[PDB]
Structure formats: structure tokens, C-alpha cells
Design a protein around this ligand. Sequence first.
Ligand SMILES: *C(=O)[C@@H](NC(=O)c1c(-c2ccccc2)noc1C)[C@@H]1N[C@@H](C(=O)O)C(C)(C)S1
Ligand SMILES: *C(=O)[C@@H](NC(=O)c1c(-c2ccccc2)noc1C)[C@@H]1N[C@@H](C(=O)O)C(C)(C)S1
Ligand SMILES: [Cl-]
Lengths: 241, 242
Amino acid sequence: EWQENKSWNAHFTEHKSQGVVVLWNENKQQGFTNNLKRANQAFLPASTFKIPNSLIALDLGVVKDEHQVFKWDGQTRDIATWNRDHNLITAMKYSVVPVYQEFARQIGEARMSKMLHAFDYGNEDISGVDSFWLDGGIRISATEQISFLRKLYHNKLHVSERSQRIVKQAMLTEANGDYIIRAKTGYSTRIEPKIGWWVGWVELDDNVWFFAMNMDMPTSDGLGLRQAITKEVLKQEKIIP
Amino acid sequence: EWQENKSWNAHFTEHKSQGVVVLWNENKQQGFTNNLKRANQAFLPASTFKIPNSLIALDLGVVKDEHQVFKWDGQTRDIATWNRDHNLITAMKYSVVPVYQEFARQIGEARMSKMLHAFDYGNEDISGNVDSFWLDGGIRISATEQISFLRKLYHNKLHVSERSQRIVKQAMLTEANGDYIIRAKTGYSTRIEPKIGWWVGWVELDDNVWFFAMNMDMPTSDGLGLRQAITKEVLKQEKIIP
Ligand SMILES: *C(=O)[C@@H](NC(=O)c1c(-c2ccccc2)noc1C)[C@@H]1N[C@@H](C(=O)O)C(C)(C)S1
Ligand SMILES: *C(=O)[C@@H](NC(=O)c1c(-c2ccccc2)noc1C)[C@@H]1N[C@@H](C(=O)O)C(C)(C)S1
Ligand SMILES: [Cl-]
């Protein structure tokens, strides 16, 4: 069912970095990783939390839809792309923390807690309300990411079908005549080790490949590798050209 | 509100072809074409019919969802990609006529008629084969009537369930990167003259939506690449994509 493929370590090594890639071939009901232990190591979700955050916000009417505008509170921050108005689409695309802090506040630790349980999301621990996924108690592994994503793909999370379709739309990262990628980036720097995340899936004509990957991210220089390494692995297994 | 930009004719000319591109800047409530007359000229919709077809099928339970498999009736056809099983996603991606003929048959001329009226879709004329009228029958739609229909689909304003619309928009997904998302549908009409290519859909940006309808003379199947290439060359020029 699960199989180690240590040959993928080469892809981490050649960029002088450590980390895990987990693939799941949906049709064959089989999974593949370069490191079974790290694949099961839990980390802070960072901006990958914006998936379940988005879903809970939508199901509760905190977000009416994906066109609804979230007004810049007018305070400049370090990320240029955060200093302007956003909708759920641009909120996810640009990982706009303040917008999701604001959703989290309206959602409320009571309901957020209930929902993460119902989702079976990582360790279901909200030790913090407006920061817990950045610097608090919540932890999720690569394989628990796949598990959550697989439920989102088949509209099996304990929220309305609409809420899921909207979040999957919002996850749209890349598409052409070969594949569709739906995914969410993450960068956790508050608690060591500093890691990059890329979780989502590859839609083909006739199969779906789910992916969760995290890698050591000591410096923000490496961030390009989250996508590049996952893709190098997807190329190798002839999932994309 | 509407503005002629004859400079775009260059893009048709340079490939020795005639045709129209219609843009609509949603935010500014303004439209742009290389030819106001042709922009209003109606043609057979061809595979662009798969949008309203998909919507009606979904709203009526002919299609349960986008994963549901449509089993190849086992008869080899000219188009390699048609000779295998399909779901609403691959059905749209590869313009699989037989699948949509089959939906049309189940939908039934009575309901298909009512729905195209409610949609205000082109000339609302289904007359011909229930299973062929959008290929060789009576239905006619212009570039501008395409935008109108598309604009309603974008805001989930067609008199069909929101779900049905979301699914068809998903299925329209053609292209996406960190700059833009294109949702669109191709068409090739060769049964009745004049032979034309279609590309209708829209470009999603961070803060705006550009709707596009384009058709061009398509005497030979050699030109088909130009449907996307000319639209893109125009989208480049107006600095909508890089
Ligand atoms: C999500 O991961 C976003 N970042 C955080 O939530 C976050 C950061 C951060 C890193 C760099 C700049 C600003 C904040 N540190 O800890 C956390 C929990 C997005 N990650 C970054 C990325 O490049 O992927 C950004 C710039 C998109 S914000
Ligand atoms: C949709 O328009 C499809 N074509 C037709 O429905 C169609 C054709 C046709 C032309 C060439 C090959 C097969 C069918 N002739 O009249 C009609 C109404 C799709 N058009 C083609 C394209 O290249 O866009 C295909 C191959 C995608 S089928
Ligand atoms: Cl989508």
C-alpha cells in the first residue's frame, strides 16, 4: 500500500536541502514517499491552514462567496501583495494572513475547534484564536494532509458541497492541456525547524495524484524549491511532462 | 460603452484570415471589437453549445456530477480522443459530440427549448435533430450574445441551480498560472457555410474579469490554432496578459 522511494532524496540533496514528498495515486489506492518517518512527522500548517479556514468561514457565512471583497485595514505590512483589497481567490493566491486572522476571529475558537475535529484535521489542537496555525499548538503531517485533501476532493468534509467547490476553485494554482494543479503553499518560521509546505493534487484526464511535501527552509531563498522539487518528482514518476 | 478598435484587424490579416474578437471589461462595464457588424453576426455555436448543454443536463439530473463516466458506445470516429470513456471534464476538454448528442436526446426538444429561452441564448431556435441542431440545425448566436450568456454564467444568474453553473465553469477551465485563469470553450462549424472557428470564455485577473467571444473564417482545419493565438495576441496588445 505505502512504499518508500529513497531515489527522490536525490532531488532534495541536489538543492542541498532535507525534506519529504508524499504522493497518493487515487485510482490504485497506493502512496509513495522518500521518507516514511518524516512523512508522518507533524509541523505547524502555516498558510496550508487557509484551506480549512476558508471552508469553515464559507460554511458559516463569514464569507458570502469568492467575489466578496475584504477591505485592507489600511496598515502597510512587509508583503506588498497584502496592501490592497482581496477576495477569497486572491486571499488564498497571496496567503493574506490578516484576512484569515479576521475570518478566524469571526469564526470563534468554539466553532473553529468543532470544525477541525469534524475534519479530523491534524492534531485538532487550537492552542492560541487568531494565530494558533502560525505559532500555536495545531500540528499536521504530510500524510494527514493527503487524508484531509482526499476528503475535500470527494466533497466528504462535514461542510456543504458548495463550501468545498468554492475552496477547490480558490486552490486553483496551474492548468494546461496536460494537467490541473490545485494546491496551497505554506511557510512556518515562528517555531523551528523553519519549513516550506506545498499540499494539493494533480488532476489528469483519468487519475488524480494528491501531494503533500515539506522541506527544511532555513532562509526564505529556498521557497521556489517547494514547487520545483515536487514537480521534479512528478516529472520522474511521469505524472506530468 | 462599445468601441471599435480596427488595429486588431492586423492580427487576423497577418494570418491571411477574416474574423471578430469581442472583449468586455466587466469592471468598467465597457466592450471592444475589431468589427461591430461581425460581432453581431450570428453563426452555428458548434462545440461552444457544450456550455449550455452541460448546464441543462446538470440541472435536470442527466449528469449527476463531473466524475460520472459516459461509456464509449464502441463505434470508432475520426477524433482519436473520442474513442474511450469520458466525464463532463474530458467531454468538454476534447469536445466529445456523441456524449452531448446523448445528453441532448435525454434532455428532450421540449425542455431544451424552454431552457435556451430562459437563458435568452442566441436566437432560441433548436429546430432540426434534437441531437444535432447546434451542429447543422437552426440555433444561431453572435459574439455579443455569447458574452451576454457568459456574463450571466459568471455571476451564477442563469435560471438553473448555482451548483450546475459552478460545475460547468470548472469544466470550462482551459488554462491557469500566477497571472490569469482562462475558462473557455472552442467550436468548429463545418456542416453549413461559412466554416468558422469559435473561442468564447473569459480571463480572470486578481481584481477584474475580461470576457471574450471570437469567431474567424476557417476554410481548412489548418487554421484552428489561430482561434486561441489571435485572441491571445489581442489580449497581449491590450495588456490583459503578459
Ligand atoms: C503562509 O504560509 C504565509 N506566511 C505565514 O503564514 C507565515 C510566515 C511568513 C513568512 C514570510 C513572510 C511573511 C510571513 N512565517 O510564519 C508563518 C506562519 C505565506 N508564506 C510566504 C511564502 O512565501 O510562501 C508568503 C510571503 C506568501 S506569506
Ligand atoms: C465542436 O465544435 C467540435 N466539432 C463539431 O462539433 C463540428 C465539426 C467537426 C469538425 C472537425 C472534426 C470533427 C467535427 N464540424 O461541425 C461541427 C458542428 C470540435 N471541433 C474540433 C476542433 O478542432 O475544435 C474538435 C476536434 C475539437 S471536435
Ligand atoms: Cl475551477
